Amino acid sequence: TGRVEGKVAFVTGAARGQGRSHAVRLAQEGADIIAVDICKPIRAGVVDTAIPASTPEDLAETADLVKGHNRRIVTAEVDVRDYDALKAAVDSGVEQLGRLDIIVANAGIGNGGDTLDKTSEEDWTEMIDINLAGVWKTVKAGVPHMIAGGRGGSIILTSSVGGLKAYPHTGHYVAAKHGVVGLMRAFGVELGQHMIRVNSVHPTHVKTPMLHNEGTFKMFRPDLENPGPDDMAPICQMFHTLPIPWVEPIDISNAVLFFASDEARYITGVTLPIDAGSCLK
Amino acid sequence: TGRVEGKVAFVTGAARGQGRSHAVRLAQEGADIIAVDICKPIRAGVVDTAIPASTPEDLAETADLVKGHNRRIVTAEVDVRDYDALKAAVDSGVEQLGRLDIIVANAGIGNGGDTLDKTSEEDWTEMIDINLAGVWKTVKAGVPHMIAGGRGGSIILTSSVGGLKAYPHTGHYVAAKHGVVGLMRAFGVELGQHMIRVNSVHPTHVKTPMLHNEGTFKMFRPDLENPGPDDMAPICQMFHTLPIPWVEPIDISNAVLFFASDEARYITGVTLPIDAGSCLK
Amino acid sequence: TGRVEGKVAFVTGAARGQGRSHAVRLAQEGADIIAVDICKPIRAGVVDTAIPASTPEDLAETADLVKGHNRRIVTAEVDVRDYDALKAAVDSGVEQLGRLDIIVANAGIGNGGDTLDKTSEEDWTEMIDINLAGVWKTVKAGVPHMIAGGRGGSIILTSSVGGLKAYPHTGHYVAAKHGVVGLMRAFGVELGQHMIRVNSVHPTHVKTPMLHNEGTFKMFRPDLENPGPDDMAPICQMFHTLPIPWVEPIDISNAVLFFASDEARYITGVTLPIDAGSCLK
Amino acid sequence: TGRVEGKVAFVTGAARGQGRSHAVRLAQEGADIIAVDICKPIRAGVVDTAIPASTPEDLAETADLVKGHNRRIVTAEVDVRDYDALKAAVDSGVEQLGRLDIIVANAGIGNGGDTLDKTSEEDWTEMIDINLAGVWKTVKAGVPHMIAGGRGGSIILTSSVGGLKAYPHTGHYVAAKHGVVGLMRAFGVELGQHMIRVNSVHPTHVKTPMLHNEGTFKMFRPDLENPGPDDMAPICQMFHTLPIPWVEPIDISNAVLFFASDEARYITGVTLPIDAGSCLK
Ligand SMILES: NC(=O)c1ccc[n+]([C@@H]2O[C@H](COP(=O)([O-])OP(=O)(O)OC[C@H]3O[C@@H](n4cnc5c(N)ncnc54)[C@H](O)[C@@H]3O)[C@@H](O)[C@H]2O)c1
Ligand SMILES: NC(=O)c1ccc[n+]([C@@H]2O[C@H](COP(=O)([O-])OP(=O)(O)OC[C@H]3O[C@@H](n4cnc5c(N)ncnc54)[C@H](O)[C@@H]3O)[C@@H](O)[C@H]2O)c1
Ligand SMILES: NC(=O)c1ccc[n+]([C@@H]2O[C@H](COP(=O)([O-])OP(=O)(O)OC[C@H]3O[C@@H](n4cnc5c(N)ncnc54)[C@H](O)[C@@H]3O)[C@@H](O)[C@H]2O)c1
Ligand SMILES: NC(=O)c1ccc[n+]([C@@H]2O[C@H](COP(=O)([O-])OP(=O)(O)OC[C@H]3O[C@@H](n4cnc5c(N)ncnc54)[C@H](O)[C@@H]3O)[C@@H](O)[C@H]2O)c1
């Protein structure tokens, strides 16, 4: 039997990166998946962002990978900011798949890059709306289905090392990610009575398009004209106690899997770094 | 002679409660004050709140108390959500008083009271807008004046025990107050280069109208028909290691004063509970 | 293929309880075991302790269980306080089993029960010597074998909820268990360069003879003449967010297994509660 | 009126450095002092230490400074490891001065410098005995006098940044200093009933002979033949968010004074860094 055999997991930001990885790993271990992603640029008139937008095709690819593990998947192209649309998608996914046992609130963005005193209200607001309020909305949408099932469940919120410590030029993201720790604790204290566990994962740098993009390469290596990942690697590695530059999506997925599984049945309220020792520094 | 002699402090939520106490204590110790408060109900059409709104007269009373210590005060009736209006008020205050050395981001609200899965988006959004984004706006408005002075300075953010641990029916407030810890850390890492310190205070229950109101008395003591503070005291006391029911505004002001003063010149990045040992439980 | 297939784990306190469970779970998942336990009363002339001593037969039983999973086990009856004897036992175990990949520093005691200001130096010293210095000695004995292997490895220290928060009448234990968090961090920063991860587990109450003994029953339920586990259960449950009285040894072993496995290859420096939400309170 | 007018403070490690500063600062603010220090080398046959020993004359110099503030002082040359001697000294001090309101458990050492896997049991044991068990003994000796006074009180334990995070080659010290956080929490939960507050201070580098010695200069600047403090400054500064190389004893004393004073009457259970932002990194 797989470690989440017979369960259903709702994963946001599932089009690519960590969210894709979570969908696929959970499916490998026996779960069917409700996979949602915006699949559009975050800001309507704007495609020229450092972090590229995801596409409908990215989400279709996630679906094909999940089906390759002989599991079912319901996909929906929906913005976690649009609560009514998100709730409709989750409602339909639970109709189709029969239950909801696991929530992985993974969807998130980067924007901005100014000091916090020079950050625009537009960048601030978008950041809070997705990375904090969107996580709230994700749990709010899924949890009535988990409660009604009467079997308990497991909720994993994606924070960051930035939910535990700060770094210059990321302050709006740090505020949001710290707020996610509050959501984890608040939901944990309210939902424990239903044998629902709530925990957060805190990745260091992860090899996804959020990290590996031209804008980010240039920010980490302003001394170079056309830096790539190999140029950024030694700078990222300085943040770690283990001598690696970043973790992989599978590393985060393996933590999510642990929390989702019955092997972590009595683990709730925890902030778990998957950070190669960043938080020891 | 005073511990903040010759300094100027910008205090939000100064109409009453802790913010009034901060303004008066800092003035007692030699600071002039830029005091801001919304001075009206939080939600335009709405006075049916458990926590009563502040008034213009409340802020005028604070001003009289500050003047009683032979210090100057500039007051403004402004909502911390309205960044342009807040910035204009602070700009005018610094014109009048000559400098800005201390920021105390104290303004905050309570609302709601449902479980977090049942919290309205209206209540959520108002809470984040004031208790998280309002604190960000407060620092953003004040800090250019502190940087430009070239003398360093001290920024104190008011979080809560709720910014460190959760309690049922307060989850949106907990998310905001945890976000405030992120703001503290983020501003701390960015502003240290200017010899600006950033720290947060985390009160337990404080005797102000935010705690002492009819709605709250009845909520803490549903067994009584007309409960007052004496009836709520033993319930609040159960949260503490020291056998007291709540701290007073002066207790929070004394911590603010410590952080504002040169006696805390090299203290930055700290989360300081004034909590009667709540966080030991 | 087991999650620790082909590895060797060194587990202290392996005669019963959590340590036995760790040996057996790790064996089930493919590891051979170096299992050590004092197998005698902690204090030479003294058998009438609240927590009963382990016996040689207890350790023989652990061995039979590991062999039942078709794995190899080397046992040794040794006190973790006797560094030279412990080192000799580990040296022999590694000779026999070929490598050392995982260290589980699980041996521990309770004693005392007075307030910390009334705790005897005898009780203090024994507590520190086993629960803090014995953990240090365990890692010190095993890690040269792990380093010399050149394959990286994983070290798990057993702390407690008492390594993160205090409770009356357990203060010497709390000091030791907080010291264990220091050892985890210190070894983590030093050993990361070898791709050796170091983490700590923090159990709430666990159903082992350390919890389930006549002395402890009477302490939790002084109102009863002959209390048993059922009488203690509701008191223990008040410490938790999930409505359970205690976790089982397997719950701790499943966390140890996660950290020991390649699925946690980049997780280091973490304090992981398996505490049913005790640390949310 | 001084901020600790009419109080008596018991300070260990009072011969020089931070302890001297605490004694003098508390005296300046109106407290009489029971000042203890070993005033001898730590290890009987041994003066070849990087950190120089204190002397009886150092303690006499502290006493002269306290008397210069027109306060009384009782001095004793006593090792905090010798509980019976320490208790006898405190008992006599309280006879002479009439009460005990404040305890400052400041005495501490450095030794060793190997990795934790290569640290001798001699160095380990001395470190735990003084920096952990010595702190326990200090509170144990003083606190009955505080309890019996019936006026409440304040206990400050000196930990370190090393009680919150680790650094290579300091692991035994880190274990002890983390244990001190456990003592603080344990005493906090037990003594709150008596209106006794317990808190810890966590200095970064402090300009005392523990930091400023030949051995340490050479260790921080192996590239130089005869390095002094000016050469060590930029290396220490790299650990901080504020651009300073170290704090001064007065900075720690100002935090001790705050906690000792009625201005911190409801503050208990807190870990307070005076660290120039080290813990933000
Ligand atoms: N990549 C890193 O280094 C790193 C480090 C720490 C934490 N994180 C966090 O991990 C999580 C996953 O990020 P990732 O690395 O996979 O990045 P990613 O950008 O590859 O994936 C994020 C996915 O979320 C989706 N998304 C964003 N906003 C959305 C919205 N409003 N509604 C629905 N979907 C939305 C995106 O379209 C994208 O497909 C995020 O919360 C991120 O903040 C990332
Ligand atoms: N009272 C408690 O028990 C308690 C406990 C922990 C933390 N806190 C926090 O302490 C701080 C002070 O609260 P208090 O106890 O003095 O309560 P209070 O309600 O007496 O005072 C808060 C003041 O903030 C003002 N304010 C609210 N929203 C505003 C806005 N948008 N713009 C400008 N001013 C605004 C109010 O008008 C009021 O005068 C708040 O951040 C609160 O969350 C309070
Ligand atoms: N049982 C609980 O509720 C609980 C809660 C939190 C943490 N812990 C910790 O979990 C760990 C395991 O305890 P357990 O619950 O399995 O209790 P247990 O008493 O059943 O098992 C502990 C084992 O450690 C062995 N041991 C003790 N001192 C030793 C020494 N000097 N040298 C070698 N072996 C020695 C004992 O003989 C015993 O076999 C301990 O570190 C304990 O402090 C236990
Ligand atoms: N100096 C730093 O950079 C630094 C940084 C963090 C924490 N600390 C801590 O601050 C405290 C004060 O150290 P300091 O900087 O003033 O150093 P210091 O060496 O100048 O002073 C420490 C004093 O403690 C005394 N002492 C040591 N062992 C003793 C014992 N067994 N009994 C009685 N007295 C004893 C010494 O004789 C000395 O007078 C210590 O706990 C230390 O670990 C220091």
SS (H, E, C) chain B: CCCCCCCEEEEECCCCHHHHHHHHHHHHCCCEEEEEECCCCCCCCCCCCCCCCCCHHHHHHHHHHHHHCCCCEEEEECCCCCHHHHHHHHHHHHHHHCCCCEEEECCCCCCCCCCHHHCCHHHHHHHHHHHCHHHHHHHHHHHHHHHHHCCCEEEEEECCHHHCCCCCCCHHHHHHHHHHHHHHHHHHHHHHHHCEEEEEEEECCECCCCCCCHHHHHHHCCCCCCCCHHHHHHHHHCCCCCCCCCECHHHHHHHHHHHHCHHHCCCCCCEEEECCCHHHC
Rg (CA), chain A: 18
Pick the closest to residue B269 from B142, B191, B184 (CA basis): B184
Query: Phi/psi of residue A280, each to 5°?
Result: -80, -10
Residue B50 has which token pair? 């458990």
CA A209/CA A37 separation, integer angstroms: 15
The residue contributing the CA closest to ligand 1 atom 17 is: A210
Is the CB of D175 less than 8 angstroms away from the CB of C124? no
> For residue B156, what are the contacts with CB-CB under 8 A and spacing of at least 6?
B102, B103, B104, B105, B198, B199, B200, B201, B256, B259, B260
Cβ(C240)–Cβ(A151) below 8 Å: no
Helical pair D121-131 and D171-191, crossing angle rounded to 10 deg: 30
Cβ(B157)–Cβ(B200) below 8 Å: yes
Strand partners, C74: C34
Helical pair A171-191 and B171-191, crossing angle rounded to 10 deg: 150
Cα–Cα distances in Å, from B117 out to A187, A194, A205, A229, B120?
8, 13, 31, 41, 9
Buried residues in C137-151 as b, exposed as e (16+ CB within 10 A): bbbbbbbbbbbebee
The type of residue at B99 is: R
| Three-state secondary structure call for residue A274 | strand
CA D9/CA D26 separation, integer angstroms: 8
Specified resolution (Å): 1.5
Residue C28 has which token pair? 């089930």
- For residue B196, the chain D residue with the least C-alpha distance is D242
Query: Phi/psi of residue C272, each to 5°?
Result: -105, 105
Instruction: Identify the DSSP state of A271.
Output: E
| Three-state secondary structure call for residue A154 | strand
Residue C238 burial (10 A CB sphere; 0-12, 13-18, 19+): exposed
Question: Which bin fits B16, alpha (ψ -120 to 50), beta or left (φ > 0)?
Answer: beta
Is the CB of D166 less than 8 angstroms away from the CB of C189? yes
Number of domains composing chain C: 1
Chain A, chain D: beta-carbon pairs less than 8 Å apart? 7
Residue B278 burial (10 A CB sphere; 0-12, 13-18, 19+): buried
Pick the closest to residue D254 from B1, B263, B259 (CA basis): B263
Question: Which bin fits D23, alpha (ψ -120 to 50), beta or left (φ > 0)?
Answer: alpha
Q: What is the DSSP string of A9-47?
A: EEEESTTSHHHHHHHHHHHHTT-EEEEEE--S-SBTTB-
Find the length of chain A: 281
Using what technique was this structure determined? X-ray
Strand partners, B158: B201
Residue D64 has which token pair? 């002269």
Residue A26 has which token pair? 């959970």
For the question of residue C173 being annotated catalytic, the response is yes
CA A250/CA A252 separation, integer angstroms: 5
Pocket test for ligand 3, best of C47, C206, C274 (most atoms within 8 A of CB): C206
Cβ(A24)–Cβ(A70) below 8 Å: no
Pick the closest to residue A164 from A12, A13, A280, A17 (CA basis): A280
H/E run at residue A148: helix A134-149
CA D83/CA C121 separation, integer angstroms: 9
H/E run at residue A60: helix A56-67
Domain that holds residue C173: 1-281
Q: In what order do the strands lie in the sheet with A73-77?
A: A73-77, A32-37, A8-12, A102-105, A153-158, A196-203, A271-274
Q: Is D280 part of the contact surface with chain A (CB cutoff 8 Å)?
A: yes
Side-chain-side CA neighbours of A216 within 13 Å: the count stands at: 22
CATH, residue B87: 3.40.50.720
Q: Is C67 part of the contact surface with chain B (CB cutoff 8 Å)?
A: no
> For residue B153, what are the contacts with CB-CB under 8 A and spacing of at least 6?
B100, B101, B102, B103, B146, B194, B195, B196, B197
Apex A114 CA angle, A111 and A116, nearest 5 = 100
Side-chain-side CA neighbours of A162 within 13 Å: the count stands at: 23
Q: Is C186 part of the contact surface with chain A (CB cutoff 8 Å)?
A: no
Cβ(D170)–Cβ(D162) below 8 Å: yes
Distance of alpha carbon C133 from its chain centroid, rounded? 13
In SS3 terms, chain D reads as: CCCCCCCEEEEECCCCHHHHHHHHHHHHCCCEEEEEECCCCCCCCCCCCCCCCCCHHHHHHHHHHHHHCCCCEEEEECCCCCHHHHHHHHHHHHHHHCCCCEEEECCCCCCCCCCHHHCCHHHHHHHHHHHCHHHHHHHHHHHHHHHHHCCCEEEEEECCHHHCCCCCCCHHHHHHHHHHHHHHHHHHHHHHHHCEEEEEEEECCECCCCCCCHHHHHHHCCCCCCCCHHHHHHHHHCCCCCCCCCECHHHHHHHHHHHHCHHHCCCCCCEEEECCCHHHC
C-beta atoms surrounding A243 within 10 Å: 12
CA D253/CA B263 separation, integer angstroms: 9
CA B128/CA A172 separation, integer angstroms: 13
CA D51/CA D210 separation, integer angstroms: 5
Pick the closest to residue C251 from A269, A258, A150, A199 (CA basis): A258
> For residue A73, what are the contacts with CB-CB under 8 A and spacing of at least 6?
A23, A27, A32, A33, A34, A35, A62, A63, A66, A67
Question: Is B253's C-beta closer than 6 angstroms to any atom of ligand 2?
Answer: no
Residue D267 has which token pair? 């503050």
Pick the closest to residue B116 from A191, C238, A220 (CA basis): A191
CA D73/CA D96 separation, integer angstroms: 9
CA D68/CA A260 separation, integer angstroms: 66
Report the catalytic residues of A. 173
Q: What is the DSSP string of A76-136?
A: EE--TT-HHHHHHHHHHHHHHHS---EEEE--------S-GGG--HHHHHHHHIIIIIHHH
Query: Phi/psi of residue D111, each to 5°?
Result: -155, 180
C-beta atoms surrounding B102 within 10 Å: 27
CA D32/CA B281 separation, integer angstroms: 34
C-beta atoms surrounding D34 within 10 Å: 28
CA C64/CA C87 separation, integer angstroms: 24
Residue C183 has which token pair? 């050892």
Pick the closest to residue D151 from D3, D5, D2, D7 (CA basis): D7
CA C56/CA C44 separation, integer angstroms: 16
Residue A72 burial (10 A CB sphere; 0-12, 13-18, 19+): middle
The residue contributing the CA closest to ligand 2 atom 19 is: B210
Side-chain-side CA neighbours of D151 within 13 Å: the count stands at: 15
Cβ(C269)–Cβ(A275) below 8 Å: yes
CA A132/CA C55 separation, integer angstroms: 53
Cα–Cα distances in Å, from C53 out to B238, C13, C15, C37?
38, 11, 10, 10
Cβ(A147)–Cβ(A194) below 8 Å: yes
CA B273/CA A71 separation, integer angstroms: 49
Place of tokens 């009563």: B52
Instruction: Identify the DSSP state of C46.
Output: B
Residues from chain A that touch C269, judged by Cβ atoms under 8 A, are 241, 273, 275, 277, 279-280
Question: Is A108's C-beta closer than 6 angstroms to any atom of ligand 1?
Answer: yes
Give the one of C144, C180, C182 whose C-beta lies nearest to D177's C-beta: C182
The type of residue at C91 is: D
Query: Phi/psi of residue A236, each to 5°?
Result: -60, -40
Cβ(D103)–Cβ(D61) below 8 Å: no
Give the ligand with the smallest distance to the CA of A23.
Answer: 1
CA B49/CA D90 separation, integer angstroms: 56
CA D53/CA D45 separation, integer angstroms: 12
| Three-state secondary structure call for residue C86 | helix
Residue D227 has which token pair? 């390095």
Cα–Cα distances in Å, from A183 out to A198, B115, B167?
9, 12, 11
C-beta atoms surrounding A148 within 10 Å: 12
Question: Which bin fits C150, alpha (ψ -120 to 50), beta or left (φ > 0)?
Answer: left
- For residue B161, the chain C residue with the least C-alpha distance is C281
- For residue D182, the chain C residue with the least C-alpha distance is C175
CA D229/CA D63 separation, integer angstroms: 28
CA A48/CA A26 separation, integer angstroms: 33
| Three-state secondary structure call for residue A156 | strand
H/E run at residue C62: helix C56-68
CA C271/CA C164 separation, integer angstroms: 9
Distance of alpha carbon C20 from its chain centroid, rounded? 10
Cβ(C161)–Cβ(C204) below 8 Å: yes
Residues from chain D that touch A281, judged by Cβ atoms under 8 A, are 165, 281
Query: Phi/psi of residue A98, each to 5°?
Result: 100, -10
Cβ(C227)–Cβ(C220) below 8 Å: yes
CA D154/CA B277 separation, integer angstroms: 13
Cβ(D53)–Cβ(D79) below 8 Å: no
Give the ligand with the smallest distance to the CA of D129.
Answer: 4
Q: What sign does the dihedral C216-C222-C223-C225 (CA atoms) show?
A: positive
| Three-state secondary structure call for residue A263 | helix
CA C208/CA B115 separation, integer angstroms: 36
Buried residues in D230-265 as b, exposed as e (16+ CB within 10 A): eebeeebeebbbbebbbbbbbbbbbbbbbbbbebbb
C-beta atoms surrounding B212 within 10 Å: 17
Apex C198 CA angle, C194 and C203, nearest 5 = 165
Cβ(B270)–Cβ(D272) below 8 Å: yes
